[model samples]
Target: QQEYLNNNQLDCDNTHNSTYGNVCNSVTSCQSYLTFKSSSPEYNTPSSISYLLNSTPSLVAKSNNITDVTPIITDTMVTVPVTCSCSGGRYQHNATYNLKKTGETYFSIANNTYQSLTTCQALMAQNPYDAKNLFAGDDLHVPLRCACPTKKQSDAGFKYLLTYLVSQGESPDSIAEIFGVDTQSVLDANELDSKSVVFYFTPLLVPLKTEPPARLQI
Candidate 1:
């Protein structure tokens, strides 16, 4: 009847696997990277990209091998570092958002500000804040759901697992093509059946052998 297994921490076992989505099978936190597309001009700067992904400007620049004074080229792929942790019966990374403007709530941040990387439900569960009473200068926790591939996925040659936020009108087939992975692998990773539908604004785990392409659609 306990909510968690180990000292209130979730375990990586078949029992904890999500039937409808990817399983959170990692035991602890680890260094993970996600490919980000600076599709817009505004997001092409280190400070801008760092702020959105909860990474340091220096780290972002170093990860992409750009000089401190140099600006990130627009429409280019940048690697963003995040701490992937397992907690609360799932796996996720907490991106800290330091609010610099008012009128931003969990719903807005999850849907618009983060472009669906985090969910409103996850944010509410991770952060101890009044969503409506937030103001400028308040730091909010943005928990991005991600996972390390299971044994079968790794045995099949997957090295990294990318947590992808599904957008409107997108499907598993399209996503599989976008990531250069097979459609069946995509379906298997997310525990989705052939007849299942991928809804909008949900996170899907995309298993990959190499670094995912830096595409704008992501």
Candidate 2:
């Protein structure tokens, strides 16, 4: 019964088509015995027997591009760093983070300013040599740092707060009332505390830029 079941499931035709004809003949004999038993009642077979047939051959396809299987490092490197000053003030000692060779970006957390490394490594191990895939828009090659510059001792914390308020287009008085801080503190940090007039100061890093490939208009 087992031999019959095996013969019914195995593809004897393909076996015969191969150069090993003797093996195919042995399989055919075994298949024939099973068929004979399945048609007989002495074997105690079920009244109805179902057979599964595979009409299509199974095939696997492979790509020819070797790069698809390996990672490729780009031939060139690009470095990008950002520095900021408070109009007349020089950059402080600890106010900067430099880009690393491994493509790490640095930023100042105090002033909400950031910079990105121009060069990036491929995120995928398989496509390391493909520079196009690495630099393509939204590809995993871009690295960014989110940071801010340090403020003067007197206005350290207040500078960030004031910068946030100005970005939101809020008046110093309104920001002071909302945050429960004195208006003078906000003004001193923003260079507007001496006068009562409302003024706006732009953030050290107002907008973050993304690295996207150039687009052509039709």
Per-model RMSD to reference? 7.2, 35.6
lDDT by residue (116-150, candidate 2, tens digit) is 11112101121233433222122222112112222
Q: What is the C-alpha lDDT of each candidate?
A: 0.64, 0.21
Q: Write the per-residue lDDT of candidate 1 for residues 91-123, one digit (tens) a residue.
A: 777678877679887777766566656556666
Best by TM-score: 1
Count of steric clashes across candidates, in order? 0, 12
The lDDT leader among the candidates is 1
Off by over 4 Å in 1: 1-23, 31-42, 56-79, 167-169, 214-218
TM-score of each: 0.73, 0.22
lDDT of 1 at 201: 49
- Model 2's lDDT to the true fold? 0.21
Give the local distance difference test score of model 1.
Answer: 0.64
Residue 45 of model 1 has an lDDT of 83
